């Protein structure tokens, strides 16, 4: 059972998803993707050292 952005897309509740939705291979099997409009990467976040 899909959910979220892909869940709304698969069940046809909406026509187009315009959101910070990352392109992934597993999502490619149920929804298509446009060319990447911006680059990013997973990072680590902590409170700056007091």
């Amino acid at each position: 059972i899909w959910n979220g952005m892909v869940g709304e897309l698969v069940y046809g509740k909406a026509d187009i998803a315009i959101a910070p939705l990352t392109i992934t291979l597993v999502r490619e099997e149920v929804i298509d993707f446009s060319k990447p409009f911006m680059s990013l990467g997973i990072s680590i976040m902590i409170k700056k050292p007091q």
Binding site: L25, P36, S39, L40, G41
Partner: protein, 50 residues
């Protein structure tokens, strides 16, 4: 001395209109599913440090 500047990779390139494009792309995708690409990455990059 820093992080990556962009998000781009290496792809197998074939002449435009070549019959080898689709089968080689399918093989690349299947090996990505099988993890042979990551295995070779480990073997040549991580498994060769001294």
């Amino acid at each position: 001395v820093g992080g990556n500047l962009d998000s781009k990779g290496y792809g197998i390139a074939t002449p435009k209109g070549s019959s080898l494009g689709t089968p080689v792309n399918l093989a690349v995708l299947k090996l990505s599913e099988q993890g042979v690409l990551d295995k070779l990455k480990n073997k040549w990059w991580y498994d060769k440090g001294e």
